[PDB]
Design an enzyme around this catalytic site. Structure first.
Site, short mmCIF file in Angstrom:
data_model
loop_
_atom_site.label_atom_id
_atom_site.label_comp_id
_atom_site.label_asym_id
_atom_site.label_seq_id
_atom_site.Cartn_x
_atom_site.Cartn_y
_atom_site.Cartn_z
CG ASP A 42 -9.72 8.26 6.52
OD1 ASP A 42 -8.62 8.17 5.97
OD2 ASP A 42 -9.83 8.47 7.74
CD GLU A 67 -6.59 5.96 2.12
OE1 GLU A 67 -7.55 6.23 2.86
OE2 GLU A 67 -5.50 5.58 2.56
CG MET A 72 -2.46 9.97 8.59
SD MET A 72 -2.67 8.17 8.52
CE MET A 72 -3.20 7.87 10.21
CG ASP A 81 0.18 14.40 14.07
OD1 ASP A 81 -0.97 13.93 14.26
OD2 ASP A 81 1.13 14.21 14.85
CE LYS A 108 -6.14 9.29 7.85
NZ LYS A 108 -6.88 8.15 8.44
NE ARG A 113 -11.49 -0.63 3.08
CZ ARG A 113 -12.15 -0.92 4.19
NH1 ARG A 113 -13.29 -1.59 4.16
NH2 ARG A 113 -11.68 -0.50 5.36
CE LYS A 119 -3.03 2.77 2.98
NZ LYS A 119 -4.07 2.72 4.04
CG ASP A 140 -1.85 5.40 5.03
OD1 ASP A 140 -1.78 4.32 5.70
OD2 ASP A 140 -2.88 5.82 4.52
O1 LIG Z 1 -9.09 2.14 10.45
C1 LIG Z 1 -9.49 3.22 10.19
C2 LIG Z 1 -10.77 3.74 10.83
N1 LIG Z 1 -10.33 4.51 11.98
C3 LIG Z 1 -9.89 3.79 13.17
C4 LIG Z 1 -10.64 2.72 13.63
C5 LIG Z 1 -10.26 2.01 14.76
C6 LIG Z 1 -9.10 2.40 15.44
C7 LIG Z 1 -8.34 3.47 14.99
C8 LIG Z 1 -8.74 4.18 13.85
N2 LIG Z 1 -8.78 4.12 9.31
C9 LIG Z 1 -7.54 3.76 8.68
C10 LIG Z 1 -7.30 4.47 7.39
O2 LIG Z 1 -7.51 5.63 7.36
N3 LIG Z 1 -6.84 3.67 6.28
O3 LIG Z 1 -6.59 4.24 5.03
C11 LIG Z 1 -6.41 3.85 9.69
C12 LIG Z 1 -6.62 4.70 10.76
C13 LIG Z 1 -5.62 4.76 11.71
C14 LIG Z 1 -4.46 4.02 11.56
C15 LIG Z 1 -3.48 4.10 12.70
C16 LIG Z 1 -2.14 3.76 12.67
C17 LIG Z 1 -1.43 3.83 13.87
F1 LIG Z 1 -0.10 3.55 13.90
C18 LIG Z 1 -2.07 4.20 15.04
F2 LIG Z 1 -1.38 4.26 16.22
C19 LIG Z 1 -3.43 4.52 15.05
F3 LIG Z 1 -4.11 4.85 16.20
C20 LIG Z 1 -4.12 4.42 13.88
C21 LIG Z 1 -4.27 3.14 10.51
C22 LIG Z 1 -5.27 3.07 9.55
ZN LIG Z 2 -7.59 6.40 5.18
ZN LIG Z 3 -4.75 5.16 4.71
#
Ligand SMILES: O=C(CNc1ccccc1)N[C@@H](C(=O)NO)c1ccc(-c2cc(F)c(F)c(F)c2)cc1
Ligand SMILES: [Zn+2]
Ligand SMILES: [Zn+2]
Ligand SMILES: O=C(CNc1ccccc1)N[C@@H](C(=O)NO)c1ccc(-c2cc(F)c(F)c(F)c2)cc1
Ligand SMILES: O=C(CNc1ccccc1)N[C@@H](C(=O)NO)c1ccc(-c2cc(F)c(F)c(F)c2)cc1
Ligand code: NA
Ligand code: NA
Ligand SMILES: [Zn+2]
Ligand SMILES: [Zn+2]
Ligand SMILES: [Zn+2]
Ligand SMILES: [Zn+2]
Lengths: 519, 521, 514
Positions: free
Chosen positions: B375, B377, B312, B310, B302, B379, B290, B315
């Site tokens: 958000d 995105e 991200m 801050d 976010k 997948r 990814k 990712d």
């Molecule tokens: O899972 C979701 C929906 N929100 C969410 C749900 C349940 C718990 C926490 C967030 N969103 C993802 C995303 O945005 N994906 O594109 C996402 C969001 C956050 C992190 C991350 C990484 C870390 F290292 C952390 F320490 C942390 F707290 C979160 C990874 C992926």
């Molecule tokens: Zn996202």
């Molecule tokens: Zn993401």
């Protein structure tokens, strides 16, 4: 002057500014109370207190040169009324020449020495008597003790509160709003107060000019139109001016300031006005105002409850105070000083082009900064402005900024906070606060918090990892961009906006001008 | 390869990357402990335990070829010290040549077999002794028993933790930072451990390379600069490479991936590197990372408390792991394999041009997708990368992604989760987790939740209508873009970032490399 | 039996329990499909799939010994219907005897082997027809493949979903016929299914009973009544004994409630020699307000927290199955530290340091993490019994909804052999569980500055694992497993309990423990 970009042709391309206000047409006359008061046309108001007697009775001490009015104002009739602060009464009667006259009083309480807050309440009561009454003249009789600075503050505050800003009214202009053409003042030792009148009129307009810029919404007041207004002001006052655009800012490597503006449709504009005295320059001063014309927060968008994104046109209040001070200084012409009026103007927006939380950016002094929150944008723009200011070779740098919302939890809406690296300069600011009657309180720069700005990757973090005392943390960050010059920082985030009246205060214009003048 | 767009002239146009690190200048020598230890210069550290004795005394077993140090290290003088895991001491003395030497120990506890977490604590205490001490050489004497993989893990972790990333310092560089120039290691049966040294050095740099890309902020590391860095890596390693741009992505109908990137000022770039063995190719593998270089969330911004916008820039950690693996694979050159390193790189931004919540977009396999949250995105970009990978005709597809924050609530910060459609492949990943010492746990793809992805209007919903187990729901969605190939999905959202040390882990480089190597042997 | 305290005279003083249900009056007959299907009365439903052709047409394979119904079931008529999982049709018609009969089908999709989730969907469509038709008999014809365990699960689920709980409100079929290939091998599952149904439904009754009805006094009273009906040994420990046992963690949780703490201990012991001893520990919080850490955040579902005794309920439903089926060579202890977590001048506070029955001092970080405190004292009690296995089952952590969700429970433990026995019980009960790790690296976050241990972690968000690490500190030298059912206990769609864990635990006792 640069062209303001538009999205649609209905977008405004300048800030409407009123220079010739109705206050400027008022003829002021000051008379000594020893000669007695003539009570003719308009409204005559006595300022009366009763020291040590809470809600005590009204007594008129001044001689009045009319037997009918003197009879009306005798103690037996006046004792039914009291001096409770802000209370007022209107009187109607015929004078010795068989003309009807209007008379009244405003209560000034029982504390012989009025604070700026008390005097403002007195002025507000007086202004209510001016509104909704078509008067050609107001006469004010001082039966209270005021020093010269407090007499000037009375006039400045009266002028400012009386003035109504109608630039953005179209179909809803007040069809009854009429201003007096004459103001009479009776006071003991009047000759010693007369020099305060035209100073008050200058201070009023510098403050009202700042308010006009602040109240102007962000579609009218953007980085291009605000710097254009600064140019026109400089042209009117014969100040030197330079507006630095993006190409010059890139050459100066102003990466912190430029990053903040990346997301805006308005190119960054850096304002540099200069006043130089005709004689030998004995002191050089840089005044730096934060100039964010709209603060959305950026990608750290102001979406939390209570973040008041709708008021963020006021995030250039610091720039407005500096430009209002330029009006006062360019008008009064102090000698032996050179003043630079600086503002790194930009707009903090959300875009494909915006800087991101986490970006590492490089300031003009070479320091790399890790951005922890795009809504801490003011300290980034100020960092580059302070580097620029110190390159000018000045004795003092003073910045003024709506920097941290924490100011509301520390000092609130009445007192600004001042921070600095030099006690002598801080004390000069506090002395200017006393003579301008714009209150400021000294707050500490606590070096123990500096380690929380250590970044794992950049030279420094923009924001703290642990400390919630953000006004102090912000000052520690700014301090890193002043190497060997006396510097003070005035955080006006809490004092800039009058929430009760829904309008700006123009805070800082008179503070900064008194600072320049008293030096 | 492609020009990086700039808003202002001060915006960077490449990621700074250090290839020759100070770790690479350390000359490492491994000696058999049976010959005794020479203690001449620098710092000499004994790795010592006391099996079965809670907090028992330090007792030195190795022969020391110096009478003075042997006297200092006698049992009577060491009994005041204990072997508590992570504890350390420093000793100063004169040797038989009347030169001053420094000696010490690090406690490895009382439980004979150390976990990866235990060995990390030992290495971290070692590194504290290297910092703030200007030493020319370090000598480590193993008085504990470690297998070959754990010895390599010790070196890899030592190298990684020792290295300090100063690429973004200008006025605040550590003026006192000095690296050792020599590393001596005394261990039993040294001949069998010598082969681990250069493997550890390769794995260290693959992990540190991934870390460099991750830690690089999103203004430096954007889809153009990251794909440019991938080309440069491929060129140095003699890998075949191709970067797909927007026009080619449009012709491939990569509509899910392209939608995510619509709001960015940086054009989408799809990385495809290939390693191919000289001999008969017995196994073909696609590794998919990814690669979201910044995740604002899009219009589903976010902005919630705890949403760490801050951070991200991390990712694209999955893409970084895949490129770090390409370094290791391209360097070690396994036989019998062809490996494709893939990443659909883009940036998720807020713009007049962004895709919107509710948009229905069409993936490259023709499936229409209803966007429920911009958000989610990752997948979407992976759906198109998986369609591309399966078109290559591979035996295994493995994706690795910082996909779901729910991972922090399921496995936490130490173990990654693996999901998949094939038990043999899952077991191969678990075996690689054991030999790489990067921990992974198998989690289920629960088919009962698939109905919550049913869309009224599109073929499928991006996100679930009701189910909060988002790591599983995301896996079910991804599963729809692999039709008939063994596939596994490694969610590293919880393990990619070291919150305590405020730096990346480079998680997954060694896991993926062990996977390739074990399948090649 | 203890007296239930009341605030007003209208407060209930017992849990209403239905023991004799209409399900118990259904006569079940299983016939082999060979020889043809008779369609004489009631409703006859064919379970039909179509492998490979997704949403393919219905085609009936069985011979039906009725010429009118055979015509209805001809391929040309049935192909107007499709096998999409859960889809159904049924029609009323006259059979050869001019008797009105209803005939139809339930679609079983296109995969040959149905999961437990697929079979639940099939059963739900079947129950919908039973709830909307006045019928004396149902006949189900299996044209799909089910093993013996899935056939029993089919019957248990049919019975459970068909039964309607009307205890708090102010006609069922009398016959069930089943046609299946190789029918003789399935016959022994029928009365086992009926026992498992009631244990599950009994647990459901305790869970669904609101907290004014089901409180620590009335729940332990119900457990005594069950033990008396099953001839189990029983002991209810009250506050004075609990104080003498120094159960300071459990007692602290209940300090703020008007109901005294009650510790349930039932015992089943085999007639022959006891070869294996097992303690089953169920979390029994009859209402979880959160305490001073009140459940006030959006989504904290304070209105559902009557279900925080679902673990206790499963353990007691298991006691019903075990006392009824009477396994040999085992002794089983059914334990629950029952209490109520409330807000009062008398409650324990965040920050309190309390002392468990093994002497460990615990710093309370959050009064809403109360389950692990009660379980800590229950585990010390269980280990003192000298058992071979301790299995606890508990609605412990909301994080389960984010890890495994609402379908699979999580199992944690200190002994791989015991974990594998639980997983095998999950396979044969068709109550799904997944093994999750106890990650020792997180243990340091429970180190307390002042007490021996923290109740909760300050930094680790993997709450289900941290809770397991905490529980492990109260089991010294015994094989132990912990099943977190917080995500799987309540059926949110149907607004009712699942009774999750009853059948899982019974299969463990019957088959896998010994
Ligand atoms: O899972 C979701 C929906 N929100 C969410 C749900 C349940 C718990 C926490 C967030 N969103 C993802 C995303 O945005 N994906 O594109 C996402 C969001 C956050 C992190 C991350 C990484 C870390 F290292 C952390 F320490 C942390 F707290 C979160 C990874 C992926
Ligand atoms: Zn996202
Ligand atoms: Zn993401
Ligand atoms: O300080 C912060 C973040 N922490 C914080 C915010 C708000 C309250 C307490 C702490 N954000 C600043 C910013 O965005 N700087 O760029 C900011 C935010 C708000 C106001 C402001 C002005 C007013 F006139 C108000 F009445 C008021 F409530 C707040 C000024 C600056
Ligand atoms: O785990 C915690 C800590 N908070 C928390 C953490 C992470 C995620 C959610 C909540 N608190 C537990 C508790 O209070 N134990 O005593 C608890 C809380 C909630 C449910 C539950 C049950 C359901 F059926 C649900 F649908 C549901 F959303 C939550 C179970 C246990
Ligand atoms: Na404005
Ligand atoms: Na990065
Ligand atoms: Zn701001
Ligand atoms: Zn801001
Ligand atoms: Zn709770
Ligand atoms: Zn609870």
């Amino acid at each position: 002057a640069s062209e303001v970009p538009q999205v649609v042709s209905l977008d405004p391309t300048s800030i409407p500014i009123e220079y010739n206000t109705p206050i400027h047409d008022i003829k002021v006359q000051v008379y000594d109370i020893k000669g007695g008061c003539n009570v003719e046309e308009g409204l005559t108001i006595f300022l009366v207190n009763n020291p040590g007697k809470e809600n005590g009775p009204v007594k008129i001490s001044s001689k009045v040169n009319d037997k009918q009015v003197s009879e009306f104002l005798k103690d037996e009739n006046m004792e039914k009324f009291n001096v409770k602060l802000g209370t007022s009464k209107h009187f109607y009667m015929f004078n010795d020449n068989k003309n009807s006259v209007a008379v009244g009083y405003v209560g000034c309480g029982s504390v012989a020495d009025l604070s700026e807050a008390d005097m403002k309440r007195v002025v507000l009561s007086l202004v209510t008597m001016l509104h909704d009454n078509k008067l050609s003249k107001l006469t004010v009789v001082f039966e209270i003790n005021v020093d010269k600075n407090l007499f000037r503050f009375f006039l400045e505050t009266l002028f400012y509160e009386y003035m109504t800003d109608e630039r953005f009214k179209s179909t809803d202009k007040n069809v009854n709003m009429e201003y007096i053409k004459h103001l009479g003042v009776y006071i003991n030792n009047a000759d010693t107060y007369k020099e305060e009148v035209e100073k008050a009129r200058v201070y009023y307009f510098g403050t009202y000019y700042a308010s006009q810029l602040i109240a102007a919404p962000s579609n009218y007041c953007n980085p291009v139109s605000l710097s254009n207004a600064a140019v026109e002001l400089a042209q009117k006052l014969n100040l030197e001016y330079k507006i630095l655009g993006v190409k010059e800012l890139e050459e100066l490597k102003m990466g912190a300031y430029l990053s903040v503006g990346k997301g805006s449709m308005y190119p960054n504009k850096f304002i540099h006005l200069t006043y130089k005295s005709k004689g030998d320059v004995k002191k050089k001063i840089a005044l730096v105002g934060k100039g964010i014309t709209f603060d959305s927060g950026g990608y750290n968008l102001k979406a939390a409850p209570g973040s008041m994104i709708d008021l963020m046109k006021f995030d250039m209040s610091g720039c407005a105070a500096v430009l209002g001070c330029a009006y006062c200084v360019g008008t009064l012409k102090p000698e032996n000083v050179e003043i630079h009026f600086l503002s790194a103007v930009c707009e903090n927006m959300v875009s494909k082009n915006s800087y991101r939380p986490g970006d590492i950016i490089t300031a003009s002094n070479g320091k790399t900064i890790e951005v922890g929150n795009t809504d801490a944008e003011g300290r980034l723009t100020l960092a580059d402005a302070l580097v620029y200011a110190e390159k000018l070779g000045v004795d003092y740098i003073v910045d003024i900024a709506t920097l941290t919302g924490a100011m509301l939890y520390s000092l609130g809406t009445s007192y600004a906070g001042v921070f600095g690296n030099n006690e002598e300069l801080i004390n000069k600011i506090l002395q200017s606060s006393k003579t301008s009657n714009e209150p400021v309180w000294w707050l500490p720069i606590i070096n123990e918090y500096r380690a929380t700005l250590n970044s794992k990757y950049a030279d420094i973090n923009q924001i703290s990892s642990s400390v919630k005392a953000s006004s102090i943390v912000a000052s520690l960050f700014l301090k890193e961009f002043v190497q060997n010059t006396a510097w003070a920082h005035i955080d006006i985030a809490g004092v800039s906006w009058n929430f009760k009246a829904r309008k700006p205060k123009g805070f800082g214009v008179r503070l900064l001008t008194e600072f320049v003048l008293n030096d």
